Structure formats: C-alpha cells, structure tokens
From Swiss-Prot, chain C:
The lineage of its organism: Bacteria, Bacillati, Actinomycetota, Actinomycetes, Mycobacteriales. Induction: 6-fold repressed by starvation. It comes from Mycobacterium tuberculosis (strain ATCC 25618 / H37Rv). Belongs to the RNA polymerase beta' chain family. This is DNA-directed RNA polymerase subunit beta'. The gene is rpoC. The RNAP catalytic core consists of 2 alpha, 1 beta, 1 beta' and 1 omega subunit. When a sigma factor is associated with the core the holoenzyme is formed, which can initiate transcription. DNA-dependent RNA polymerase catalyzes the transcription of DNA into RNA using the four ribonucleoside triphosphates as substrates.
Length: 88, 195, 48
DNA sequence: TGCCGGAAACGGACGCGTACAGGCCGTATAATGGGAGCTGTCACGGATGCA
DNA sequence: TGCATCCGTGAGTCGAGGGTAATAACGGCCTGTACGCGTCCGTTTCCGGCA
C-alpha cells in the first residue's frame, strides 16, 4: 500500500518492518518443517493403489501448506485437528 | 529444474565422474541431494580479507573464553557458598565433599562443552580457509553455518543445477593439457587414472 | 513413466512458484530426478 | 413404358429452455517418522574403498 | 600397494497361450456443452395426364 505515492519511511521503521516481514516467513517455514511428520503419518495409509508413497507425501505437504495459509489461532483449537482435514 | 542423464552417471565407467574427476559415490551424493558441493570460490576477496576474518575469529574466540572464565568465577563463587554451607554445620565427611565433587564435575562438563565449541569453530575456519571447487560439504548444519558466516567469497549449491554450473565453469583445453602432462610424467596408478 | 515425469515436474513447478521450504523443494527435485532416471533406464539404480 | 416436370417427405443449419458434467471450495476434539521382501548361476572384467 | 566387495552381462531352438487389494461426502455455484421441435435444400416416390 505505502510503496506507490507513499512516503520516505524512516530507516529504523523500514528496517523493523522488513525484519518482522522476514520473521513471518521464517516462522511459516519453521511450522512447515515441524509438521511434515503429521503429513507423512497421515499418508502412510493411502499407499498400495495407484500412487507412490513419496508422491502421496508430496501431495500431503501441499495440503499442509494450504492448511497453514488458512490456519488461525483465535479459535483455540490444536493445529493438528485443522491440518488433518486439509491434508486428507 | 534440470536433470542429469542416467547413462553418463551410472555405468561401468562413470563418464561424469571421469570428466569432473569426481568419485561416483560423491557424484551420487551430489545429484541426489545428500551432500552440498561448492560450485565456485573467489580468490582475491579471500586473499585480501583473510587478515580481517582471522581478526574476527580471534575476537569471537576471545569472547568465548571470556564467557568461559566468567563461568569459572561463577563456579568459584558457588564453591565458596558450598564451603560456607558445608564446613559450618554438622555433616558427614563424605557429605561435605559430595557437593564439591558435583561442582567439580559440572565445571569439567562446562569446560568440555566450551572445548567442543572451540573445536567446532576451529574446523569451520579451517574448511573455509581451505575451500576449493569440487569439494563436498557434508553436515548440512556445518554448511549452513559456513554460508551464513561467509555468504560471500564463494557460491555453493547441490543437485543437477550445481552439476550444470560445475560443467559450465570448466576448461576442457586446460584439463586436457594437464592430463597430458600427467600421462607423460606420472607413473603407475596415477598414470592409469589419467589415461 | 511419462505420466509420473509430467506429474512430478508440474508439482515441482507448483511448489516453486508457491514458495516452499528447501526440504520439500529438494525432495520434489529428487523425485523428478529419480522419475527421469526410471524412465530412461528402469532398475539401473535402486529398486526397479 | 418410359419420360418430364414439378411436387411430397427426410434431413443440414439452428434461438431456446433445460439437463448435467465437471470443477472448485470447504469442512474444527485428537491424531505427529513405511512395510517389506528378500538373499539355489557362473565366469569374466573392472572399478572402488580401505588396510 | 594388495585384498575384498560389489556390480553388470549373458546363459536356444520351434507350438501351447489373451481380463488384478485396501473409502467421510456432501451444499453453492457456475460456466460450458448439448439437444429436442420446426422450415429451410435436396432426394425418393407421387400421381395427373399422356404418348
């Protein structure tokens, strides 16, 4: 929003906002790497017909990515419950 | 993303390995995302920043040893407190030294951890100062630490893209001349491999 | 084999332009590499 | 009998109103690292890793 | 430097022979595709008169 027709933002303000923007991505990747185990555990049982185990795993991580994009904390539910639906 | 042809990597003689002077096992590790490889390294920047990087390493080691002697003095204060609380009340002869032995063991494990960190920093610096192309960097953690501490002075990837870049930065004429010199001058196994 | 190659290439493209961690991206790249290897010569390396 | 010269349905292009075919999205307690099948040939050559 | 380990390759010839493991399932919508009578071109009988 503030890039076009905006203002010359202060150096400290701009660096802090860039830092939090980077930290959001860092946290997202951290959560993804942490929760790949749920994906593989859920995909362990869909093998044996058509697809390969690793292909099922990859589709599982795609579903987990969408799950973390759509996930929210304000409802007080565990992340696994919401992620299972998207992975499946 | 690029892929590598299976014929020239897996076979009786490994053609990619023979061309790049790489062992087939290392080549498999490289092109199967099991080990990083250094695509290229700079010489002038390393040469003229060696002094300042050594100074930075010395400063960091001085900070770590300052933390170490801070731990030593904290352990000394703890030992003084244990002496005050044990040599002033009624306790067993072994009981008044149990806490001393425990503190000694904690001090030993603290200095052992410090020695491990010192050795880790030493090997990181050694592999940075002896960096060269066509060198595999196992221990992804070590590679990541080396990258974040020394993002410049070199570039390194892993996989088919890295192999493609390695082939890109290759001089067939110089390689042929070097191999010709080796086949003229060397003897035995080196000459056979050169052939 | 061609279907596996195409599927893994497309999935790699989707992961790349979506933005994925290096672990997943490298795993998908290895998937594509192994699929191409199987297409060119099945059973040459690993389980056929 | 056959031919002439149009005349009767049986078929290519359809707005229209409807059928459905297929695709996308989204689901809230909790669940967090595989089954798995193999290894009864024999001679040859060669490349590789390690003592 | 020698030694073991491993990998890979080739090891017949002629008929007889053909179809398989493993689960959330719905709303809302939406755009696309189709396709069923009617009037046109056109081709197989029509039938009125006829030579």
């Amino acid at each position: 929003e503030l890039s076009e027709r905006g203002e010359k933002l202060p150096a400290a303000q701009r660096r802090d906002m860039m830092w939090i923007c980077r930290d959001g991505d860092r946290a997202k990747n951290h959560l993804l790497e942490a929760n790949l185990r749920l994906v593989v555990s859920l995909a362990k049982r869909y093998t044996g017909r058509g697809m390969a185990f690793l292909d099922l795993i990859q589709e599982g991580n795609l579903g987990l990515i969408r799950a973390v994009e759509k996930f929210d904390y304000t409802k007080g539910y565990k992340f696994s419950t919401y992620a299972t639906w998207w992975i499946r | 993303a690029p892929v590598t042809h299976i014929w020239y990597f897996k076979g009786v003689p490994s053609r990619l390995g023979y061309l790049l002077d790489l062992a087939p096992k290392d080549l498999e590790k490289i092109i199967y995302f099991a080990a990083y490889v250094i695509t290229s390294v700079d010489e002038e920047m390393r040469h003229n920043e060696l002094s300042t990087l050594e100074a930075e390493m010395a400063v960091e080691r001085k900070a770590v040893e300052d933390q170490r002697d801070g731990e030593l003095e904290a352990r000394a204060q703890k030992l003084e407190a244990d002496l005050a609380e044990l040599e002033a009340e009624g306790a067993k002869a072994d009981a008044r030294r149990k806490v001393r032995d425990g503190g000694e063991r904690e001090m030993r494990q603290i200095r052992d951890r410090a020695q491990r960190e010192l050795d880790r920093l030493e090997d990181i610096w050694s592999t940075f100062t002896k960096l060269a192309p066509k060198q595999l960097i196992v221990d992804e953690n070590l590679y990541r630490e080396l990258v974040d501490r020394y993002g410049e002075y070199f570039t390194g990837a892993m996989g088919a893209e890295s192999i493609q870049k390695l082939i890109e930065n290759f001089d067939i004429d110089a390689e042929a001349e070097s191999l010709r010199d080796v086949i003229r001058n060397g003897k035995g196994q080196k000459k056979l491999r050169a052939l | 084999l061609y279907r596996r190659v195409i599927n893994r290439n497309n999935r790699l493209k989707r992961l790349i332009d979506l933005g994925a961690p290096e672990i997943i991206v490298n795993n998908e790249k290895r998937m594509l590499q192994e699929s191409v290897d199987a297409l060119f010569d099945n059973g040459r390396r690993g389980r056929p």
